[PDB]
Design a protein around this ligand. Structure first.
Ligand code: HEM
Ligand code: HEM
Ligand SMILES: CCCCCCC(CCCCCC)(CO[C@H]1O[C@@H](CO)[C@H](O)[C@@H](O)[C@@H]1O)CO[C@H]1O[C@@H](CO)[C@H](O)[C@@H](O)[C@@H]1O
Ligand SMILES: [Mg+2]
Length: 174
C-alpha cells in the first residue's frame, strides 16, 4: 500500500549498515596494527560482496514491485528525476564492489571473504590493478557525495516539505 514492502525496507537499512561498515573498515584501517590488517580487509571485502548481492536483489525487487506513491504527489518530472537518481545509485553501488572484486582477482593472491578462500588470477595483472584501484577510490569517494545528497533530499522531504517520502521507507507506521 503506502510503504515499500518490509523486505525492501529491511534491505535498504541493512545495506546502509553494511556500507557504513565497509567505509569504516577502510577509513580506520591505520588505527589497527599491521597484524590486524588481514582481518580488516576481510571485513571490508565481505561487506562489499554482501552489498553487491543486496544491490542486485533490491533492484530485482524494484522491478517486481510498484514504487509506493508520495503524498502529496510530486510533479511527474520530479518522480522521473528521483527515479533517475535511484538508477545512478544502483549503478554506482554495483560498479564499486564489482571493481573491488576484479581488483582482488587480478592481484593474483589468495584472499578471503566470509572466512572462505576466493578465486584469483594464476598470474597478476599490474596495469589493470593500478587502474582498478584508482577507479575503486574515485567511485568510493563519489559514493559519499551521492549518499549525502540522497540522505539530504530525504530529510528535505521529511522536514521541509513535510511529505511522506521518508515514512514510506521507515519500518514503523508513524
Ligand atoms: C559498496 C561497497 C564498497 C565500498 C563503499 C568500498 C569503499 C572503499 C574505500 C573508501 C576504500 C579506500 C579507498 C581510498 O584509498 O581512499 C576502499 C579500498 C579497497 N576496497 Fe573497497 N569498497 C567496497 C567494496 C569492495 C569490494 C567488494 C572489494 C573486494 C572484493 C573491495 C576491495 C577494496 C580494496 C582491496 C581496497 C584497498 C585498495 C588498496 O589499499 O590498495 N572493496 N574501498
Ligand atoms: C540516512 C541514510 C539514508 C536515508 C535517510 C535514505 C532515505 C531514503 C528514502 C526516503 C528513500 C525512498 C525514496 C523514494 O521512494 O523516492 C530511499 C530509497 C533508496 N535508497 Fe536510501 N537512504 C539512506 C541511505 C542509503 C544508502 C547508504 C544507500 C545506498 C548505498 C541508499 C540507496 C537507496 C536506493 C537505491 C533507494 C531506492 C529504493 C531501494 O532500492 O531501496 N540509501 N532512501
Ligand atoms: C569508530 C572506529 C574506532 C576505531 C578504534 C580502533 C582501536 C580500538 C578498537 C576497539 C574498539 C572498541 C569498541 C584499535 O586499537 C586496538 O584494537 C584492537 C582490536 O582488537 C587491536 O588488536 C589492537 O592491536 C589495536 O591497537 C583504537 O586504536 C586507536 O586508538 C586511538 C585512541 O583512541 C590511538 O591514538 C590510535 O593510535 C589507536 O590506533
Ligand atoms: Mg516496479
Amino acid at each position: 500500500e503506502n510503504k515499500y514492502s518490509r523486505l525492501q525496507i529491511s534491505i535498504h537499512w541493512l545495506v546502509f549498515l553494511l556500507v557504513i561498515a565497509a567505509y569504516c573498515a577502510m577509513e580506520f584501517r591505520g588505527f589497527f596494527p599491521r597484524s590486524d590488517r588481514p582481518l580488516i580487509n576481510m571485513i571490508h571485502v565481505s561487506c562489499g560482496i554482501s552489498i553487491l548481492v543486496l544491490m542486485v536483489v533490491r533492484l530485482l525487487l524494484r522491478l517486481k514491485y510498484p514504487t509506493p506513491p508520495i503524498i502529496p504527489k510530486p510533479k511527474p518530472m520530479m518522480t522521473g528525476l528521483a527515479h533517475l537518481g535511484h538508477l545512478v545509485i544502483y549503478l554506482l553501488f554495483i560498479a564499486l564492489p564489482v571493481i573491488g572484486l576484479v581488483m582482488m582477482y587480478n592481484r593474483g593472491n589468495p584472499w578471503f571473504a566470509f572466512g572462505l578462500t576466493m578465486p584469483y588470477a594464476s598470474e597478476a595483472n599490474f596495469e589493470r590493478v593500478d587502474s582498478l584501484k584508482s577507479w575503486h577510490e574515485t567511485l568510493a569517494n563519489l559514493g559519499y557525495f551521492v549518499i549525502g545528497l540522497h540522505a539530504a533530499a530525504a530529510l528535505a522531504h521529511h522536514y521541509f516539505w513535510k511529505d511522506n517520502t521518508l515514512l514510506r521507507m521507515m519500518p514503523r507506521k508513524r
